[PDB]
Design a protein around this nucleic acid. Structure first.
Lengths: 148, 258, 50, 175
RNA sequence: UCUGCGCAUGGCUCAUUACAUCAGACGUAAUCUGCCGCAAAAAUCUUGCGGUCUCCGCAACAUUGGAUAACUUGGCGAAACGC
RNA sequence: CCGGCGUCUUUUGACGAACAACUGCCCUAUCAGCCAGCGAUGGCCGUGUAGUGGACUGCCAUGGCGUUGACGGGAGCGGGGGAUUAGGGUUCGAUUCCGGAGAGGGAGCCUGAGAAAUAGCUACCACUUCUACGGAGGGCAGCAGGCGCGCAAAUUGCCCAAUGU
């Protein structure tokens, strides 16, 4: 077809490796992005697919919607500690541990790192839901399913 | 690779003792898992009593006088799990192992034409090469060409006289069903409901006869028959009904007065 | 040294000797395994052998 | 020897791991294989799976594919134009996955002319078909730009797909 | 003595060691897996004889080839699970 | 004419191997800042591995963690469990079972499905044994036993009958 140079800044190009979208057709013309070839994947635990993934343009290999990355055992919740880093957020879980001797609780927080899909971009203080995926960096094991 | 097992770390459903010996047999891998199986030597020696010693069990089995699945075995250690027919033709007796009520291995005695029947639960179905469908079971048996109506977690009646599969039975609806593992072992009842939790274990609620409902995991369901009057195979000593602690003790005393 | 001389395709082998004198009158640095050697080198009683 | 581990590395807290265990053979790097151009040479290594994997050295031929028409033919690898990773690589004409390359292009030409009983099949295939312009110009000359979509360093076979309009237009402009 | 299988398990000891290790629960759609079990398997121009050009014609439990230890002979070294 | 064994490759259950994570863990602030030249946190493309991954190369971004105690130091193999307590607790765990690690101290390697094996190999270092001194070896935290050590701890016995491999 033709290039979209809004996405591209890479020395490698970026393509979607699931489905060929690089074929020339006039069927990607006179349309915003809807008629353009995409890959889409449902998450079947009740996490409804966004619009953005389905009709989009964005190329990411580390989100379950546009990739073969899969959602497995654990699903947790947590807020947004910071939005810093590119396609990576920082989540903070907070829970309560109990101590028997004093019969009294304590507050303890896990500050964790996650890979946030370029679909979502939640503000600080928002609550996020996150699933269990294969390792994606040194610290990152999670992915963003949904945002509240 | 483990090649040794210690008596305590071994199941006490094999009913070994703390004292006498230090080791227990670790069986060769086969149809059944380490915890759910019972090794040949244990059966012959400690239960049937055709052997008084380890070496005597080798004497019988290596020679061959013993069959399981109707096939003769020259194996000293082999698993025997659940719904396995074992036949010693010298005695002329046919045992069918099962799960007795109260967590015990049952050894139940069957008419000769029932010992050609067997029931295998299906685990996965998949298409293999040539478009040839396969049901793989919980005993590792491969049923070529299963019915198009087969699903995961259903039973397939399996002729051991000549190998094939007659009509199936499903886990659908209320049907007479029994439990495997989970310490509700050998308890029989209807399926009242099947709960779903996707991405996690699927609870099922069973209701045994004379009420008293309860819950066990889908994974631990093993079908028996369509109905309790349509069962293909025998029940163990107790019918699949448990009783209260008080009543156990009461009956133990009543019989001891004889 | 010694020689153990062997005739292939009978399997006969026999130990023969050679003096130091013999060796001294020929090179040993120029000779190595895989080299064929003419009889005369070994001081004869081996003449015309290879 | 060489290992792949997080236990010689700093934590997220900036602290240091402390050891108690000598390194496993389960974790195990090996030195990178260098696939270039020249005469084919293949040195196997035995791996943990009880099978061999093949170290491509100096592969000068690849099995290349033309997109959209579902075909492929062998042809000769001539040059490397470009790579994402480094410029250094390109100059030595190393072959590693997602290098753009240059190929003989001859069999593709031959094929496309075949794309009395025969004759009317052609006319049917000519109908409802077209080709990108930047493709055909190159394909005329007898050179083409392709990508190597198999990793040659662990199979010792270099297979590639041929660039088509959307992606071709990008790599072209990077040169 | 060649060949096959096992010897990595058992046994013994706590030195390192605090996001390590371990315990309960959980995943490997991110992978390997001998022995064991249930099983699967239709690529393959070969062999022999006769004539004869390295070519043909017939025939069809397929009728295949070459070494190496023990051993024998000469031995070596102070000794050597050394040659 | 039939039976019992044996083997190649393919296939997937079992027995295991190898990774990752949710939650939990003694004292110390007279240890408060820690992390990135040479990877610290992340993105992008490759490389490597049986495999995921800064595991690693190159490029780009400037992050990551901390008084809810990071980082550093001291003491300690972990758990099941032991002792003591009316209750709440207090204290112990070197040691039979399970899990991990080690074989004088370190590193490297072959073979194998599985080992970074040590009664397998290669090298160095600390020790140590033979030799007509040209060379050749040894590794008990396996069972006995000996020396040393300290307040402190058994026979150079008999047997594969039993229990396992």
């Amino acid at each position: 077809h033709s290039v979209d140079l809004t996405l591209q800044h890479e020395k490698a190009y970026q393509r979607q490796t699931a489905v060929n979208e690089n074929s020339h057709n006039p069927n990607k013309k006179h349309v915003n992005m809807s008629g353009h070839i995409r890959y889409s994947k449902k998450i079947g635990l009740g996490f409804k697919t966004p619009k953005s993934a389905i009709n989009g343009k964005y190329i990411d290999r580390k989100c379950p919607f546009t990739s073969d990355v899969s959602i497995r055992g654990r699903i947790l919740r947590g807020v947004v500690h910071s939005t810093k880093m590119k396609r990576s957020i920082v989540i903070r879980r907070d829970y309560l541990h109990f101590i028997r001797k004093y019969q009294r609780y304590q507050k303890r927080h896990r500050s964790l790192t996650v890979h946030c899909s370029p679909c979502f971009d939640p503000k600080p203080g928002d609550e996020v839901i996150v699933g269990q995926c294969r390792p994606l960096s040194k610290t990152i094991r999670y992915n963003v399913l949904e945002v509240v | 690779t483990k090649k040794h097992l210690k008596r305590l770390y071994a199941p006490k459903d094999w009913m070994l003792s703390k004292l006498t010996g230090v080791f227990a047999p670790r069986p060769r891998a086969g149809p059944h898992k380490l915890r759910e199986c019972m090794t040949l030597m244990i059966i012959i020696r400690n239960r049937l009593k055709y052997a008084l010693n380890a070496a005597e069990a080798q004497m019988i089995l290596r020679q061959g006088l013993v069959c399981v699945d109707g096939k003769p075995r020259k194996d000293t250690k082999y698993p025997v799990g659940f719904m396995d027919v074992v036949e010693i033709p010298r005695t002329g007796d046919r045992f069918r192992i099962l799960y007795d009520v109260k967590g015990r291995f049952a050894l139940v005695k069957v008419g000769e034409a029932e010992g050609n029947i067997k029931l295998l639960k299906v685990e996965n179905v998949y298409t293999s090469t040539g478009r040839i469908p396969v049901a793989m079971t919980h005993d590792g048996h491969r049923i070529r060409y299963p019915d198009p109506r087969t699903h995961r977690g259903d039973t397939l009646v399996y002729n051991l006289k000549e190998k094939k599969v007659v009509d199936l039975i499903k886990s659908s609806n209320g049907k007479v069903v029994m439990v495997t593992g989970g310490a509700n072992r050998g308890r029989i009842g209807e399926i009242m409901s099947i709960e779903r939790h996707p991405g996690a274990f699927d609870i099922a609620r069973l209701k045994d006869a004379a009420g008293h409902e309860f819950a066990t995991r889908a994974s631990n369901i093993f079908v028996i028959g369509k109905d309790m009057q349509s069962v293909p195979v025998t029940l163990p000593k107790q019918q699949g009904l448990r009783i209260n602690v008080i009543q156990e003790r009461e009956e133990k005393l009543i019989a001891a007065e004889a | 040294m010694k020689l153990n001389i062997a005739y292939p395709r009978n399997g006969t082998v026999k130990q023969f000797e050679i003096t130091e004198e013999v060796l001294r009158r020929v090179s040993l640095t120029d000779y190595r395994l895989g080299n064929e050697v003419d009889g005369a080198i070994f001081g004869d009683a081996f003449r015309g052998y290879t | 020897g060489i290992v792949r581990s997080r236990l010689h590395k700093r934590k997220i807290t900036g602290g240091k791991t402390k050891i108690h265990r000598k390194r496993m053979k389960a974790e195990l790097g090996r030195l990178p294989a260098h696939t270039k151009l020249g005469a084919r040479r293949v040195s196997p290594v035995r791996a943990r799976g009880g099978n061999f994997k093949l170290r491509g050295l100096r592969l000068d031929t690849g099995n290349f594919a033309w997109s959209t028409e579902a075909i492929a033919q062998r042809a000769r690898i001539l040059d490397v134009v470009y790579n994402a990773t480094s410029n250094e690589l390109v100059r030595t004409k190393t072959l590693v996955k997602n290098c753009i390359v240059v190929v003989d292009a001859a069999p593709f030409k031959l094929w496309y002319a075949k794309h009395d009983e025969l004759k009317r099949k052609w006319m049917l295939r000519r109908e409802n078909h077209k080709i990108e312009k930047a493709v055909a110009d190159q394909l005329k000359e007898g050179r083409l730009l392709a990508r190597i979509t198999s990793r040659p360093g662990q199979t010792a076979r270099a297979d590639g797909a041929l660039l088509e309009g959307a992606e071709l237009q990008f790599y072209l402009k990077k040169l």
